[PDB]
């Protein structure tokens, strides 16, 4: 057991060395994370990539000796927290809507907005702004709302909840926050019902209404949840981490400056260097697994430490180097195997459109700050700044 709350923000800020340390000793290690939780950590690209889609590791709480709370299980009815089948019926209901193709239509809007967002920000006399409260957050929370059909006056309560889940002032807010969403969202599910809305949510109400055997009132809720969430506190951070990455390394930022074709590649490398997902989501071996000696026993929670997998000197030699030339082919910033991210299509869309914006409508764009002044979330699942200021001139 290696405590993580005790390691400090230092770990948060730069936990890569520890990951190194860990991998060098073995594939798996039981550790305590910042919130009293005593979990497992899988490290190393080779060992991790395997785990992610290894049958033996379940994502269904029933294969977990760790109990859920009313707040919890009232929402775990999502494709992501289900194993096959089920995860087959659920994901096979939104698939057709998140394909690279379909998704591309959303573009003009993931355009219309990334400009409006950029405009208010450019309304800084001083020249300074915290990209986080300007782009990063705003963007992701708009597109999805305008998709799962989320009223404007409520797109705020969400940033409120997402926070408490990420790193709550105290491991209690989250349990209350879950109630809210679980409630605001159920109340939302009704507004739709009856109306003739065309958004994805409305679209998911007629499916439960018609045949609740295809989608349950619970899975509908589950669904609505995992879609809003599982892509809000991930996109936002890729955005920020992406800017802190591209702003810190001038050789590249200048490269991508003159040439803007390295954009589609800039993003893929902003996910290999430091993507928003520090570690995969909870996995439970249905039966005791044997990762060469280290034996995680039944029901135990597991986390694939992506951030380390993504820094394997054997697949990304010179790991700690951020080269938008680098061959990002092989990164697991989106997961792998059946549970792979159903949003990579949508995600990238927003990202690339964004960097282009900020780089094309922000002259002397630069870090209006120093590393020593950053602040990263302690959670070992995420990896993002609490805020990130910039200046343009
Ligand atoms: C760029 C930001 C994003 C990142 C880094 C990301 C990454 C991932 C990863 C790693 C998983 C793997 C889960 C696991 O195996 O533990 C996942 C699953 C998923 N993500 Fe994302 N995601 C992003 C954006 C999106 C967006 C915009 C949506 C919006 C709907 C989305 C919805 C979900 C859902 C619902 C799954 C379920 C996959 C399944 O069980 O079939 N993701 N994501
Ligand atoms: C998609 C990558 C991010 O993962 C999430 O969105 C995870 C799945 C999400 O987990 C929990 O969300 C609750 C609202 C419901 C709960 N379940 C028990 C009913 C589910 O496990 C995040 C909100 C949790 C973590 C802290 C996070 O912020 C994001 C992590 C990414 C890896």
Tell me the CATH number at 286.
1.10.630.10
Ligand that lies nearest to the alpha carbon of residue 240, given by its number in the listed order: 1
58 lines ligand 2 (CB under 6 A): no
Tokens matching residue 64: 């977990």
- Confirm whether residue 223 is marked as ligand binding: no
| Minimum-distance ligand 1 atom for the alpha carbon of 140 | 27
| Minimum-distance ligand 1 atom for the alpha carbon of 332 | 10
Distance 333 CA to ligand 1 centre (A): 9
Domain count, the chain: 1
d(CA 107, CA 114): 10
Angle between helix 109-121 and 344-360 (nearest 10): 40
Residues 6+ apart with CB under 8 A from 282: 39, 59, 64, 301, 302, 303
Tokens matching residue 327: 């061959």
CB-count burial class (<10 Å; 0-12, 13-18, 19+) for 101? exposed
- Confirm whether residue 41 is marked as ligand binding: no
Torsional sign, CA 253, 254, 257, 258: negative
- Confirm whether residue 9 is marked as ligand binding: no
Substitution candidate for ligand 1 out of 230, 306, 383 with most atoms within 8 A of CB: 230
Q: Report yes or no: 282 and 302 within 8 Å, Cβ to Cβ.
A: yes
Tokens matching residue 259: 């040439």
Tokens matching residue 372: 């020593």
Distance 196 CA to ligand 2 centre (A): 31
What residue owns the CA closest to ligand 1's atom 30?
Answer: 227
Q: Which domain holds residue 304?
A: 1-393
Q: Report yes or no: 117 and 100 within 8 Å, Cβ to Cβ.
A: no
| Minimum-distance ligand 2 atom for the alpha carbon of 225 | 14
Q: Report yes or no: 145 and 118 within 8 Å, Cβ to Cβ.
A: no
379 lines ligand 2 (CB under 6 A): yes
CB-count burial class (<10 Å; 0-12, 13-18, 19+) for 67? exposed
What residue owns the CA closest to ligand 1's atom 2?
Answer: 235
Resolution for this experimental structure (Å): 2.8
Q: What are phi and psi of 18, to 5 degrees?
A: -55, -50
Structure-solving method: X-ray
| Minimum-distance ligand 1 atom for the alpha carbon of 275 | 5
Reference 343, options 278, 277, 387, 283; nearest CA is 277
- Confirm whether residue 177 is marked as ligand binding: yes
75 lines ligand 2 (CB under 6 A): yes
């589609």: which residue's tokens? 264
- Confirm whether residue 228 is marked as ligand binding: yes
Q: Which residues of 380-392 are buried (b: 16+ CB within 10 A; e: fewer)?
A: bbbbbbeebbbbb
Ligand that lies nearest to the alpha carbon of residue 35, given by its number in the listed order: 2
Q: Report yes or no: 46 and 39 within 8 Å, Cβ to Cβ.
A: no
What residue owns the CA closest to ligand 2's atom 28?
Answer: 166
Q: Is the backbone of residue 288 left (phi > 0), alpha (psi -120 to 50) or beta?
A: beta
With residue 57 as reference, give the H or E element that holds it.
strand 57-58
Reference 143, options 175, 173, 111; nearest CA is 111
- Confirm whether residue 226 is marked as ligand binding: yes
What are the contacts of 78-85 at 24+ separation with CB within 8 A?
A: 78/219, 78/222, 78/223, 78/225, 78/226, 78/230, 79/222, 79/223, 79/226, 79/342, 80/226, 80/230, 80/281, 80/339, 81/222, 81/226, 81/281, 83/58, 83/59, 84/338
How many C-beta atoms lie closer than 10 Å to residue 365's C-beta? Answer: 20
d(CA 43, CA 111): 38
| Minimum-distance ligand 2 atom for the alpha carbon of 232 | 6
- Confirm whether residue 129 is marked as ligand binding: no
């Amino acid at each position: 057991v290696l405590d993580l709350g005790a390691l400090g923000q230092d770990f948060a800020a730069d936990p890569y060395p520890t990951y190194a340390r860990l991998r060098a000793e073995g594939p798996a290690h039981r550790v305590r994370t910042p919130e009293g939780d005593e979990v497992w950590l899988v490290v190393g690209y080779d060992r991790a990539r395997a785990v992610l889609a290894d049958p033996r590791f379940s994502k269904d709480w029933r294969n977990s000796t760790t109990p859920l709370t009313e707040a919890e299980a009232a929402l775990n009815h999502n494709m992501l927290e289900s194993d096959p089948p089920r995860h087959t019926r659920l994901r096979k209901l939104v698939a057709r809507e998140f394909t690279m193709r379909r998704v591309e239509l959303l573009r003009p809007r993931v355009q219309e907005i990334v400009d409006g967002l950029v405009d208010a920000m450019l309304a800084a006399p001083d020249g300074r702004a915290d990209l986080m409260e300007s782009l990063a957050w705003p963007l992701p929370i708009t597109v999805i709302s305008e998709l799962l059909g989320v009223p404007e006056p409520d797109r705020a309560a969400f940033r409120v909840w997402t926070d408490a889940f990420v790193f709550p002032d105290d491991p209690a807010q989250a349990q209350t926050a879950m109630a809210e969403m679980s409630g605001y969202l159920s109340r939302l599910i009704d507004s739709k019902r009856g109306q003739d809305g065309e958004d994805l949510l409305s679209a998911l109400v007629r499916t439960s209404d018609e045949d609740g055997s295809r989608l349950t009132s619970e899975e509908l809720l589950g669904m609505a949840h995992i879609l809003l969430v599982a892509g809000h506190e991930t996109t936002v951070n890729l955005i920020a981490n992406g800017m802190y990455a591209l702003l810190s390394h001038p050789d590249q930022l200048a490269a991508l400056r003159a040439d803007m074709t390295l954009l589609d590649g800039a993003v893929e490398e902003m996910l290999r260097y430091e993507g928003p997902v520090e570690s995969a989501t909870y996995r439970f071996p249905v039966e005791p697994v044997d990762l060469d000696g280290t034996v995680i026993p039944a029901g135990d929670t597991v986390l694939v430490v992506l951030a380390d997998a993504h820094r394997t000197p054997e697949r990304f030699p010179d790991p700690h180097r951020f080269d938008i030339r680098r061959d990002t082919a092989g990164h697991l910033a989106f997961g792998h195997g059946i549970h792979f991210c159903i949003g990579a299509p949508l995600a990238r869309l927003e990202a690339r459109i964004a960097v282009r914006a900020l780089l094309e409508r922000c002259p002397d764009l630069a870090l209006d700050v120093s590393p020593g002044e950053l602040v990263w979330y302690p959670n070992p699942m995420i990896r993002g700044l609490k805020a990130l200021p910039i200046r343009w001139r």
